[PDB]
Structure formats: structure tokens, C-alpha cells
Design a protein around this ligand. Structure first.
Ligand SMILES: *[C@@H]1O[C@H](CO)[C@@H](O[C@@H]2O[C@H](CO)[C@@H](O[C@@H]3O[C@H](CO)[C@@H](O)[C@H](O)[C@@H]3O)[C@H](O)[C@H]2NC(C)=O)[C@H](O)[C@H]1NC(C)=O
Ligand SMILES: *[C@@H]1O[C@H](CO)[C@@H](O)[C@H](O)[C@H]1NC(C)=O
Ligand SMILES: *[C@@H]1O[C@H](CO)[C@@H](O)[C@H](O)[C@H]1NC(C)=O
Lengths: 106, 121, 431, 431, 431, 121, 106, 121, 106
């Protein structure tokens, strides 16, 4: 089961690390999504620090042990969103999503 | 993605939410359904591989839903039976990147727009 | 690292290396877009743009004009397996039906997944940048075939965009369609990382490959499919290092000669090289060049492996009495040599050669007794034979000595024939 | 392609390949003109032109600072011949009287023909473009020693014209004057086309070479003659593929072990690798490095050929009873291994390896019996030995099985010495 | 040169070559200053400077992701010694305390001498131009993250300064951190000249090395230490050719065969290859890879040398009767072949082959008798064995013939085993 | 090129035509004669290799003409005996690039301006 | 004996292929000569599509079987000339010329 | 760089001259003393290797001067005993490039500005 | 013992060779020092034609047999100085200086 901090805040232009924790991340990569309200989730990072094309170069990933984290450099106001991690469980068949982090930008 | 079939019904009935008009070649890609209860977090619903094998389900639905695909028309179906009140959610249609099923990747991309399914008294 | 000297046969076994075994191939198919370059012509004499356009057009057309001694056996099998796997899949992409399918996949976006008619699944990638420049900018700059325009910014820019394309041609043209390694230009760093991340193996292996991609790059190779329209199509075979962190050990040996009544008798072990154990069986990797080390990790190719019975480790323990036929070479004339090891050196030093060990603090420490001797990298920095000088491996570890009177001294040699090459030990001694 | 499996010796012979044999060398002597760059100097400090001129002027100086196991035997004579034939002509050009004769030939025009004093006739080519730029433009754009001039167009142009020159120096410097292959820079496509077209062979051969010029390019080499004034002189040796479309065949083998009261007896064929027939003689090509396949064509070097007698083909028909001394290796302990072949694979599978065949059609197909077995390309896509996996060559073609008792199961083995490396079959059996 | 034909064994010995022996390694440590390129960013879309800055930043980050058959025996020891000496020295440098020491040494000037904590002396060299450009010009030019400035001269200059840096990365990433040779980009001519002229040897050796730096460059190799801050640190490992102008000779052989009532017997000498004297000891250099000639000089690596007793020369005089065990291969199938030599060719042809010799004066001179014969390069320009032509070396030197009945026709051959791979002569004959 | 000796003569007589003042290294090239009767197509006449071996002729002249060369003066000569009225033609002097006789190349370059031997009544 | 069409015509700026046929072309190369009506022949193309210097990139050629062809691409006014193919006979000591195509440009 | 101890003394006495404030990492470089009588040519005086071994002297001084070094303070000394009237010279402090002692190089760079030592009645 | 001339003169703007001879030069490299009056000697050349950084490219040198030579190309006004050659003795343990050529520029 994946787990996340329910809320995090960052000072504008300061950096922040969201983190997602779960035993299965040792075997399977995470995917990171953001969800601004109403809109469908948009893939912002996957794997060990690969960005989809078009996602700005500020997002970067890191991971160790059984933990992953998404680092927002130079956090802009447009970074305020829900961030969800997901990964497969040790079956390899069932996907699980974290509870999502409601980040907010001051 | 022209997604349809989403409305409202009294519990204990059946409905189907189809996702079609794919811009990418729908064939050769695995597909998944993900749902979002109003304001709540995301839940994975079902999955299917590109040849139609490996239908699998979350335990919240393991007995009830069916996931089906047509590679000739380019359409994905999730057909719901014995619909229960907790099943009210936005349903999203999502794509699987993996080439090989043994791979380690576990993200989704190409998230469709939402298809709101409601269940009410 | 733990290194045992085996004086029963003048050999060392160094344990504790961690395997990295190639167990498959992964295929990415690239389309490189060079646009409508063959229409453009210059009516106005020599110029910067004409020279770069000429290079592009020339390079583009040039592609159309293109296309038991276990150590011997294993490397033949290895390269045969590699080439057939590559050609067998290339021959499946080369059809016009599939090239149009690949182009249809990639038409909207830069990465796509395709199943070939032959049932294999490939990643596909478009290197689109040059077509975009040739179409959107250069084509409108050259009005009316006047190439010698006043704006230099086009000329310098064009030299940058075609730079990658010309390098790809250069590597294929020099190799007749099958390159020896994945150049910087066949697959960039970003393209390589995004390719490895899709491989059919668990995250543990992939995390290692990403932190070690210079080895993944080195062992793969590329194949030219051809030039179709004005797109170059080529494919890259990437090694799946599907098994990691199994045990491995290396065996080294030197001539175990010894003497009676003024006649030497010699033995040298012929089973040198790498061994790795995997899921309960032992694989022997005899090729001189298909295992490579980087610290404790040794990178090896499973296709170069010869399976050996698990009892074969008994040649490292009590070779004098194991029933397994330990391969040895026998002879009458002693050879003097230094066989270096990860944690030391075997010195074989016999009649008429002078051998001594030295250090960087003091040049000479001792002169060695005759016969096989094990010099430890903690006890000397250098060892020298007959004015030759060798530098010992300074890596720290632990050493053991397994005592036992040498085989060549314990038995009496067979009277005829001596000088048997690569035979089982029973055939040389206790006749 | 027709592939026969020979049960008598666990070996496959694949017929129907078409020869391409190198039978001579052709020489083109280039002169590359740098012009009087050594007189130009700059007095403005750093600038674009100064650094390009420094590169050009420095590289021009650097050039002045360069002055019976039948496999190993064949590749020896092959390389000694190539290097010798090249040096013998370079030593003839290197005289001052000849370099002046060559440059006197090429004074009015870019290609000329000249007889060396040693009697060989060579094509000669002038690569003149850099001298034109240096003498006609750069030497007037600079005046006094103003070198950081305002026109950027001059500096960008210069970095193109000298680009070829620097690449030539690069390849010679890394190879001590003798390159391994003909880079695009030593001889460009147009120059290579004109060179090949002059070669001393009939039109049929030349048409083939023009469509395979990557392989001609790969198989030649170049020699630096020296720097003479501001001109580099170097020569390229091009392979004359004087014979084409003769028959060839490839022989593959695997350990033919057999069991007797719980002991083993083994045999391996050593007469392995490529054969081609030419004008009623058989030639054996034992190196791994020489012969290369492209479709049905095999590109081979007659300098590596060994003239095995006719009747040597009898080892492929009735090895048990031919009077030709078919070369085999003998021993007790069975190796298990997969030998690939163009249309299939041989699996040697003994003493407790696990062997099976499979396909991309779902699942594994069959666990194999022990003993030498032939798996056809049409039957399976993959074969696996003890967790290793091999992918079979997809090419379609006829297979035959030549039935017969394996020799290992038909004769009693010699009692001593039982293991023998490379011997006639009668040293091993029926003693 | 002098060349003797030894008809006792159908072999030639050519002598008078002058040695050049590698006897050590010399280390130069390079720091390549890239500068603060990982902060500079572009905010204004595609441009020239963004493309070159992207290439730079992309290379700097990707660079952080890396890291008895006497023949075969010799080459293993040789290559193991080379790589071990390099890794041992690199491991001293890779500590952060030493990288900061080297940089502190080089802070005010471009070359300095350092001692590593592990007791060794190294030269150190800083190549600094790219940091000078980045910190003093480009960083002020792209003032406000606006990279698409109007001045083109910045973009062209930047492509020149970063060029060396990009080439160094390219050669490491293709080789996983250990290059095969010292490219021009690892050391320029000036850097190589100052390095060689510091080496620990008397002036005579250096003057030769310094006029042959292309061969010094080829023999050495480089190792990546890492990327520290914004400096790439790598080291080069140069050969000390500490001994020159000792005597050397080369031995060549061809199969010597005879008949007795229509059944052949043959032997071939197995001690082919290079020999040299050094300080009164004889060294044998069996690896094909590890001796190379350039005219009268032969360049060899002392680590490949196996020491042989001085009596080994007796096999070149009276092989019939020497008590030294001359190595031969014996058998009964007469192979026909040509073996070239610096001043001639040995031609062996027997039943079913038609040797003949020819010249550029007239294509045919003489059909050869059956047997082993010595064709002097003064007597013919070419020899042809069967539809196949070899071209002789035109070097000039005296030849001798040492008359004598060949061994193959003087002794009765052993009855069993008649075929023996690599064995003392007395096992084959006079049983 | 200098070309000389072109003139009228009565049939049954003899004449000499020559080709000279070559700009290229005449000593190393084979040379050929090619003739053009007025308005008609071209006919090959004779040939010579660079060392003066391999004189060859077309059968219309095989018995009559002689082709000769002087590598010291740099001049090529064709001598005509028993001129017959069909021989009225412009005679061009032409160069053969072949490095080796057994090569497949078959073309000429370096055509001279030709001389008009006009045998007539 | 080489054989060739006596006359051919092409529309200005259209392409045209002149062809020359004879058995020996299968074994020896050919060369194509232009001839302006008053002037010595000038080599346009030789071998498997090689041009001398100066001869514009408009001229090109190709071969198959026992035929060779000269393709004038974008026929210009200056292309109106006789074109003569030549080769060698099956013996290789006698050269032979085809009766050149008179080409006219409309 | 500073150099000190320059002065004058009557013959038959002792003095010490020193070289200091090095800018080049004195610890790893061999060092040499080299002197110049007024208007005369240069003479080498003494030498020392980097670890303080191999103290060497010219025969003009071989029993008199002593060269020594302190790798912790970064100073170099030459002590003069029984000065004789011929020893009037400028003494320069000079640095040795050699990495290895058996190298072929022989020059010195980094010549200091020199200390005048006079001796006189 | 190294030896070289007492003095040499050069016509401005053309070459001059200073030469220094002594048996030991056969075996150890030389160094060439410039000394303008009063100032400390300054290294202008060492080894086989290697210049210290900052010494203008006019200075150059070469060697043959037991002799070494410094070639000043285009002798400028700033070249007037003493030049001192230097080597080790045959023992490789004592250094020696060749005396000095005073060079003057006319
Ligand atoms: C370098 O210098 C050379 C000569 O010193 C320059 O060559 C000149 O190039 C121009 C074209 O760029 C030629 O103009 C053209 O001439 C032809 C003649 O047939 C005509 O058809 C064209 O319409 C145009 O007028 C010019 O003739 C030529 N100079 C000479 C003496 O022939 C060259 O441009 C300079 N620059 C470079 C980068 O090489
Ligand atoms: C020239 O351009 C047209 C379209 O503008 C295209 O159809 C044609 O293929 C181009 N030329 C070549 C050689 O492809
Ligand atoms: C000694 O050899 C025998 C015979 O194979 C074997 O059974 C025994 O295990 C060996 N010794 C050890 C310690 O394994």
C-alpha cells in the first residue's frame, strides 16, 4: 500500500519535496501525476527521473530504498495541485494510488 | 476521446462506459480504467492487455465489472452490473505504456477526459 | 574479495565478485528524418549553405549504396547468437508494410509501441529535428535557388542540425551496416535512459543499468534497415542484464613444475577464467574478452557460457583425488612467468632465471626461492623477473593459503607421451 | 539455401552461398593540398581565424612526427601479405623523384595516371580544395597581420574547408600511419566510385562492387607516404574482388558424445568454418575474421585460403570410412552446448543439463532427449539450455537429414591417450 | 638485414632488427575545466547558443554515469598488467583529498608536479580554455537568460572552445572509462611533447620516443577519474620505452614434409615469432598483437615476453641434434601454403598443388619442384600457389642458405600417436 | 593539339598524319585514332598501348595502316598506305584512361580538333 | 555491334532517355559522347554513371541487362546534339561506335 | 618570494642565506642554489631533492657549505662556513622540474630575484 | 665542461644561431637561459624545442650529435642579452653552465 503526506506547503520560488512511501516501490517504478481541480490527471514524471515531453524542466525525481520523491525546483504558483503517486503491488497485477498530496503555494 | 454512457441510475442496475476515438493506435497498447469519487483520491478499477488477455480487477469490483475491447473498431468497454451506491465516480480511460508485460513500469498516460457516472436514490 | 592460493596446483581462486549476466535483447527502432533535401539546388556558385546541403545530400545517397578448446567454441556461439538475433528481427522490419506502419505509429508523436508481423514488440522513436529545420526554415530561405543569402545564421544553424545525421552515416558506412557499439549518435543519453526503463525486467536490474549505462551502451549494437523516402531507419539491440548479484569467481594458474634427478615435470591448469553460479548451476565463461570487471561487478554474456557439472569445483580443492577430469597441460620444459591476480601474483621461477620482489619504500626486499610462490600485494609493491618489472594490484582484501604438497612432486609422470596438451590429469600422472 | 544435417558426426553443412574472393590490390595515390599556411601569422590575440589556423598549422606539423592449428596459420599469412604488398608500393612512391613526378602529373587537372619506377601503374588524385581557399581568399582577407577581421563569413567558411584535412590527420595519428579501414575522409564516395571503375576486372565484378562499396571500403586500408611541402601524400589499397559467384558452403559441428556402460566417448569435427570451390580446386578459409556473410554472398580473402584437397568433402558424406584423414578432437567428458546454423541449431545435451525448445506461440513446445539433436528453424523460434535462451535464424530454406549411426556409438575408443586435440579420426577409434 | 633459410626445418630467421622495449608507465593527470555551465539557462526558445550550451550541459551530466600455448598465456599477463597498473594509480587519485590537492597545485599555473599519498610521482596538467570562455565571456553575454542575442560571434566561438571537451567525453562513453589509445583530444601534440620529455630515462631513449610519438600515442591508454565540481579529471598512462637498440630476430616456418612409399610425414616449428636479446638474456614474444615493426625497429612490450634459455637459439642451427627441446607440431597430412618473410617467401606445396613464380617483367618464370623451397625476393616479384598470387617484399639484404637434410626425411617417424599438436621434437622422431 | 598532314591526295598513294603538343603526360596513356566521314557516324581506326605494344586495327584498315608513337618527342603517328576513296574523313586523336588493359573501361577522352584527309579524284 | 535509335525528340524541360544496345555492353562498360555538329566529340558520361568535370548534373545514366541509357534531366536548349555510345567487342581489342542518336529540342 | 641573509662579512666567518615565501607548493619540488660573481658567468652551488635526500655540492664548496630545507615552514637554507674572498656573488634560488631523479631534464626555472653576499677586507 | 663562443652579433630582423657544445649534451638535455643585465636569469628554452609559456615563438632550438643550438628568428631589439647553456655532467649529479655568449643587435 502506497502512502503520502496529506498536505504540504512551499514558499514561492522555494523548493519542496513531496514523498511517497510503500514497500512495493523496491520492485516497480512509480508514476507521478498532478491534478488541478476538475481536470483529468496529467502525467508529470515517471520512472527514475524521466519527464514526459512538454512538462517543464523544473520537476525532477529521486528515489532510494522503498521511497520516492518529486522535487519541484523554483516552485511556481502554477504548481499548486494534487500530486498522486501510483505503482503496482507485489502481485504485479494490481495498481495502487497514494492518497494524494494537496500542495499549496504561498 | 469520445467517452459516453455515463449518467445516473438507481442502484442495482447496469450501465456501460465506452472510450473510443483514440488519436493513437488503440491496438498494441494496454488499457486501464481509473475512477475518482467526488473530491476523493484515485482508485484503479480494471485492466486489459493488448490482445485482450489478462483481464484483472480491483477487489472492490472483482465480482461485478467486466473489461472488454474491440481492436477492429478501436473501442474500450467497461460493463457494470449490480451497481452499488459507492460506485459513483468520474471514470477515466487510460493507456498503458509497457512493451513487455514483465516490465517494471507502472504509470499511465493519455488520460481521457472524465465520464461522470452517478448513482442515487 | 577473498583470494585462496592453491599450492596443490599453483593456482589462485578469487571469490566474491557479483555477476551481471546478459540474458536477452531489447529492440528500439529509430526513424531519422532528413526532409525533402533532394529537391533543393543552388544556382549561385560556392557558398556556406551549398557546402552543407551538398554534404547532406551526398551522405543521404551514400546509405543507399550500403548493404576441446572451450575458448574457441564459446566465442563463436556468442557472436552467432548476437548477429542472428539482430538480422532475424531486422529482416522482419525491412518490409514496406512495416516501415509504413512504423511511420504511421510515429506520425503524431515522438515515441510509439509497435508489434511486428513476426510477433515481437518494439519501442519506436523519431529523431525528427532535421526535417523540421529543412521544411520550416531552410526551404523558405532559399528563394529561387539563390543559396548564397546574406544571413549567416542559417548556415551556422544548419551545420548544427545535420551534425547528428552525418555521424550516423559515418558509423554505418565504416561498418557495412552493423556497428560494433551504440555510439553517442545512434542513441542519445535521454533516448537510452528512456529505452532501458521499458525493458522486461524488474526495477532492481534497471536501477543498476541506469547507473551503469556506459556498459549497456558498449555491449549493444545497431543495424541499418535502410533509407525509405527521406527517412533513415535503423535499429538498436540493447542488452537485458536480467540477472544480477549471483556469485562468481576467477581461477588463475601458473606452471607447477618440479624436478627429480635433474629432470623437470610440469603441469598447468587449463580451466582458467571466469565462473559464475546461477540458480543452482555453474556456468564457465572461457572467452578471453566476454567478461569484464568494474569493481566487484563482472559483466558477462550468457551466450558465451559453457555449462559445467557442479562437481567441477573439486579441481579447486583436492585435484589430486577428485574423480572429475580436471583439465591440465603436461610437459617436460618449465616456463618462468608471472600470473597476476586481483590480490597478488603467482611467480613461477625456475632454472636459470632470477626473481625478486621490491617496494616503493625500498627497491629490493628479497629474492625468491625457486618454484611456484605466491607474492601478496600487502607484502610487496613490485615483483621482477629477469629485468622485467610488474606492478601488483593494490586493492585490499584477504588471502588464504591451502597447504598441500604439489601434484607434480607427488606423482611420477607417464613415460610416453609427455607434452600432452589439454588433457585430463589422470592421463599424465600415476601411469 | 540447402542445409544437410550429418548424423554421423553431429555437424551441419549449408550449401548455396555465393563466393566473393579478393584476388588483388589496386592503388590510388592521393595528394592533398594544404597551401602555404605555415607563412600566415596573426598578431591580434585570440580570434576565430587564429584558432582555426592554429589547428590547421599544428596538424600539418603532427604528420611529420609519424615514421596444425590452421586458423592461426592462415590469419598470419593473410596479414603479412596485406601489409607487405602495401609497404612495397609506399616505399616506391616515397622517393623525392616520384612525388615530384606525381605532382607534375596532377598540375593541370585533378586525376592522372602514372607508372612508378618499380613498374606498377597507379591512379593519382588531387584533393585541392583547401589550397584554393588558402591561396585565393584567406591570404588576401588577412593583410598585414590583422586576423580578428570583422567578416565572420571568412571564419565559418574556413572551418569547413579544413574539416577534411584534420580528419585525415586524426586517423593516421591514431594508427601510426597505417589505417585499419578506408574512412570517408581518405577517399570520398565520388572518388571511390571513380577508383573502383578503373579496376583491372571485367564489368560483372565491378557492377557488384559498386553496389557493395561499403564492403570494399571496409576491407581496404591506407598508408601515409609523407608531407612534401604543403602537400600531404597518402595511398589507398583497394581490394580487387576478381572472382564472384562460385559455390561455397559452411560446416558446423557439435560434440558427438555417446555413452557406453556409464562411460562417455566424444568426438568433435575440427574441419569447421568456410569452404569455397574455385576453378576446380577447393579452398578452406579457417580464420574467424576473414569471411563475412551478406545474404548469400560471402566476402573472403584468398590470402587466408588453404588449398585442402578434393576428397576433403568426403568427411561430409561417409566420415566413418573415407580414407581422407578427417580432423577430429577426442575426449571423455561431454560438453553440452548449442551450435547455431543459418537454418537451425545443433543442441548437444548430456549428463544432466536440461534442454527444451520453445516459440513465440505461447509456451514451451518440448523437452528434448539427450544426445545430439537438430532443431529446425521451421519447428521452433527459440531453444534453451539450462536457463540460457537462444533465438533461431529465421531464414527459410530446405533441410535434409542424412541418417546414420554416430561414429561415437559405433567404434571402440583407444585406451591411451584417450584425449587428443587435433588428430586424424583413426588415432581415436577402431584401434 | 640478414635472412637465413634453414632447410633442416623449412624455416627462416631474419635478424638485425633493433629493439624498442616498453619497461614502465608514466602518468600525467589532466584537469579539464568546464566551468559553471549547469546554472546558465535560456528563456527565449531555440537559438545557436542554447544548442551548444545544451550539448555541453548534456555531456557534463552524462559523464557521471560511467564507472603450453605460449601465445594465449603471454597476452593475458600483458593486458592484465597494463590495466592493473592503471587502476592501482587511479585509485590513489580518486580520493577527494587528492583531487583537491591537484587543483590546489594547479591553481596559479598550467603544470605542476604532485606526489600521491601512495608514494608515486605524477605530472599534472590543466586545460582551462573552456572555463575562461564560460566565466569571462559567455556568462556576461547571455546577460538575462536571453540566449538568442544578436552577436553571432559568440555562438561560433563557443562551438570551437567546447569541441575538445565533447571529444573527450565521446571517447570515454564509447569505452566505459578506459580508452584503447591516447586520442589527440586527451593529449595535444604540445602536451605529449612536454610529457615524454619528462620521462625517467636517459636522453637517447627520449629522442627516439619524441620522433615516434605516434607510436607512443598508440601504445598508451587513458583512465577517467571522474567529474569533480565542474572539472573533468582523467589520467593518461604513457609507455616508457626504456631500452632501445638491442638485437632482435624473427623466426618463420612452413610445413616440412617427406615421403616413404607414398605415405607422408610432416612437422612444423611452433616457436615462430619475435625474439630479442636484453642484457644477456633471451626473451620470446609470442603474442601476435604485441610486436610491431616500423622499418628496422620492432616495438614490443616487455610484459608479453616469456624468458627462454639461451640454448633456444640452437633450434636455429642444429635442430637435428640439440638437447634443447625444440617445439614442433607433427602429423601426416601435407599442408601446402606460403609463409612470407621480410626478404623472401617460404613456399611449401606437395601433391595436388602447382606452385610457380613470376615477375612484372614476365608473368611466369619457373614452375617449382615439389617440396619446400625458398623464393628470394631478388629472384621473383610474385609467387602463385594455386590460382592465388602473393607479392613479395622488396627490402634489400643478404640471404644465406644453411644446407642440410631436412629432419622430416632423416628420422623414422613414431608409429603412435603420429599426430601431436605442440610437443618436444624427440617424441615425433627416432622412436 | 598540333595535328598535321591532312590534305588531298589521289587514291593509291600514301600519307602521314600526326598528333603532338600534348598537354598531359603523354608517356603514360594509351592512344587511339577515331575517324568521321563527312556527316556520317564515328568509326574506330587503330590503337596503341603506352609502351608501344598491342597495336590493333579495325578490319577496314587491318592490312594497310600503321600506328606508331614516339615517347621521347611526344608525338603519335598514323601512316596511311594505299589510300582508297572511302577513307575521306576527319581523323581525331584520342586518349585512353585505362590503367590496366584487362579493365572494363572502354571510353576515350581528350579529343583533338582533328584533320581532314580528303582523298579524292 | 552496337545499335541505337537514329533520332529522338523531347519537349523543352521534359526529360528524355536515349538508349544504346548491344550484347557486349553486358561485359564492358560504355561511354557517351556529345557532338555539336561542327566540333570534336566531347565525353558526357562514362561507366556506371560517372561524369567528367564541367558536364552539368543534368546528364545521368543507368544500365540493365545488355542495355545502357543516357537520361537528360530537364532538357535545355544546349542539349541538341548527336549522342554516340561506344564500347568494346567481346574480344576486348576492338572498339565500336553506335550510329549516334540525333536529338532535337522543341 | 623573499630571500634574506645577504650582507657583508670579513673572510673566515659564517653566514646563512635563505629562500622563502614560495608560491608553487615547495613541498614537492627539488631545489638548487646557483650563484653569479659580479659580471662573471653563472656557477652551480648545491642541490637537494624534495624529501631532503641527495645533498650534492660543487667541488668549489664541497667541504664548506651545507644546503638544507624545512618542508613544514616552506623555507630553504644554504649555510656558508669559512667564507673565502672568491665567494662574492649574487645567490639565486632555483627550482627543479624533474619528476623522477633519473630523468634527462637538467634546467631550472622560477629563478628568484637573488641575494647579494659580499666578502671583503 | 660545456663551451660556447664569447660573443655573437646579428643584423636586426634576421636569424642568428647560438651554439653550445660538450660531450654530456649527448646524454642529458640542455636548458637555455636569457639574462638581461642585473635581472635574474629567465628560462627561454629547454629540452628538444619546448618553450616555457609566455616566451615568444621567435625563440627556437635544435640539437645534433653532442651539440645544441638556439635559433632566434627575426632578432628583435628585446633579444639583446647574455645566453647561458646548461646541462648535467656525465655522472648525472652535478650541473654545469657553459659560460655565456653576449649577443648584441645591430
Ligand atoms: C574566393 O576567391 C575566388 C577568386 O579569387 C572567388 O571566385 C569567384 O566566385 C564567383 C562566384 O562566387 C564567380 O562569379 C561567377 O563567375 C561565373 C563565371 O562563369 C559566372 O557564371 C557567375 O555568374 C558569377 O559571375 C567568380 O568568377 C569567381 N572568381 C573568378 C576569378 O573566377 C570566390 O568567390 C572567393 N570566395 C570564396 C568563398 O571562395
Ligand atoms: C521534389 O518535391 C516534390 C514535391 O514538392 C516531391 O514529390 C519529389 O519527390 C521531390 N523530389 C524527390 C527527388 O523526391
Ligand atoms: C576429495 O575428492 C573426493 C573425490 O571426488 C571428493 O569426494 C571429496 O569431496 C574431495 N574433498 C573435498 C573436501 O571435497
Amino acid at each position: 500500500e502506497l502512502t503520502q503526506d496529506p498536505a504540504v506547503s512551499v514558499a514561492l520560488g522555494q523548493t519542496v519535496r513531496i514523498t511517497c512511501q510503500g514497500d512495493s516501490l523496491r520492485n516497480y517504478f512509480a508514476g507521478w501525476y498532478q491534478q488541478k481541480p476538475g481536470q483529468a490527471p496529467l502525467l508529470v514524471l515517471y520512472g527514475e527521473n524521466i519527464r514526459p515531453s512538454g512538462i517543464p524542466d523544473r520537476f525532477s525525481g529521486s528515489s532510494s530504498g522503498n521511497t520516492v520523491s518529486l522535487t519541484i525546483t523554483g516552485a511556481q504558483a502554477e504548481d499548486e495541485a494534487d500530486y498522486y503517486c501510483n505503482s503496482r503491488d507485489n502481485s504485479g497485477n494490481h495498481w495502487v494510488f497514494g492518497g494524494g498530496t494537496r500542495l499549496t503555494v504561498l | 476521446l469520445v467517452q459516453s454512457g455515463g449518467g445516473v441510475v438507481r442502484p442495482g442496475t447496469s450501465l456501460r462506459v465506452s472510450c473510443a476515438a483514440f488519436d493513437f493506435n488503440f491496438r498494441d497498447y494496454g488499457m486501464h480504467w481509473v475512477r475518482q469519487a467526488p473530491g476523493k483520491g484515485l482508485e484503479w478499477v480494471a485492466g486489459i492487455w493488448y490482445d485482450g488477455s489478462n483481464k484483472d480487477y480491483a477487489d472492490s469490483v472483482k465480482g461485478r465489472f467486466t473489461i472488454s475491447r474491440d481492436n477492429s473498431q478501436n473501442t474500450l468497454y467497461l460493463q457494470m452490473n449490480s451497481l452499488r451506491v459507492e460506485d459513483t465516480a468520474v471514470y477515466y480511460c487510460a493507456r498503458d505504456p509497457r512493451t513487455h508485460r514483465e516490465g517494471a513500469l507502472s504509470h499511465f498516460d493519455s488520460w481521457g477526459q472524465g465520464t461522470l457516472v452517478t448513482v442515487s436514490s | 574479495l577473498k583470494e585462496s592460493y592453491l599450492e596443490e596446483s599453483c593456482s589462485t581462486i578469487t571469490e566474491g565478485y557479483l555477476s551481471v549476466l546478459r540474458t536477452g535483447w531489447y529492440t528500439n527502432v529509430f526513424t531519422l528524418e532528413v526532409g525533402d533535401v533532394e529537391n533543393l539546388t543552388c544556382a549561385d556558385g560556392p557558398s556556406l549553405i551549398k557546402t552543407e546541403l551538398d554534404l547532406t545530400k551526398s551522405a543521404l545517397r551514400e546509405l543507399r549504396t550500403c548493404s576441446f578448446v572451450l575458448g574457441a567454441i564459446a566465442c563463436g556461439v556468442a557472436t552467432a547468437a548476437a548477429v542472428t538475433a539482430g538480422v532475424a528481427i531486422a529482416k522482419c522490419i525491412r518490409l514496406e508494410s512495416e516501415v509504413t506502419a512504423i511511420k504511421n505509429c510515429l506520425k503524431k508523436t515522438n515515441e510509439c509501441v509497435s508489434t511486428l508481423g513476426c510477433g515481437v514488440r518494439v519501442l519506436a522513436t523519431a529523431v525528427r529535428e532535421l526535417k523540421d529545420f529543412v521544411s520550416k526554415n531552410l526551404t523558405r530561405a532559399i528563394n529561387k535557388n539563390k543559396c548564397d543569402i546574406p544571413d549567416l545564421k542559417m548556415a551556422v544553424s544548419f551545420s548544427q542540425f545535420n551534425r547528428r545525421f552525418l555521424n550516423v552515416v559515418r558509423q554505418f558506412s565504416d561498418n557495412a551496416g552493423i556497428t560494433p557499439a551504440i555510439s553517442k549518435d545512434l542513441m542519445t543519453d535521454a533516448e537510452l535512459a528512456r529505452a532501458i526503463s521499458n525493458m522486461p525486467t524488474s526495477a532492481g536490474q534497471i536501477k543498476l543499468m541506469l547507473e551503469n549505462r556506459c556498459m549497456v551502451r558498449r555491449k549493444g549494437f545497431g543495424i541499418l534497415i535502410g533509407v525509405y523516402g527521406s527517412s533513415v531507419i535503423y535499429m538498436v539491440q540493447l542488452p537485458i542484464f536480467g540477472v544480477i548479484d549471483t556469485p562468481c569467481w576467477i581461477v588463475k594458474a601458473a606452471p607447477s613444475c618440479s624436478e627429480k634427478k635433474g629432470n623437470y615435470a610440469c603441469l598447468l591448469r587449463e580451466d582458467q577464467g571466469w565462473y559464475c553460479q546461477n540458480a543452482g548451476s555453474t556456468v564457465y565463461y572461457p572467452c578471453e574478452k566476454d567478461c569484464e570487471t568494474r569493481g566487484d561487478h563482472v559483466f558477462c554474456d550468457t551466450a558465451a557460457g559453457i555449462n559445467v557439472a557442479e562437481q567441477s569445483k573439486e579441481c579447486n580443492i583436492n585435484i589430486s583425488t577428485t574423480n572429475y577430469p580436471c583439465k591440465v597441460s603436461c610437459g617436460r620444459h618449465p616456463i618462468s612467468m608471472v600470473a597476476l591476480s586481483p590480490l597478488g601474483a603467482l611467480v613461477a621461477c625456475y632454472k636459470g632465471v632470477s626473481c625478486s620482489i621490491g617496494s616503493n619504500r625500498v627497491g629490493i626486499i628479497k629474492q625468491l626461492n625457486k618454484g611456484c610462490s605466491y607474492i601478496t600485494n600487502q607484502d610487496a609493491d613490485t615483483v621482477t623477473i629477469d629485468n622485467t618489472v610488474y606492478q601488483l594490484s593494490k586493492v585490499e582484501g584477504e588471502q588464504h593459503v591451502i597447504k598441500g604438497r604439489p601434484v607434480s612432486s607427488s606423482f611420477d609422470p607417464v613415460k610416453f607421451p609427455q607434452d600432452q596438451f589439454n588433457v585430463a590429469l589422470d592421463q599424465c600422472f600415476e601411469s
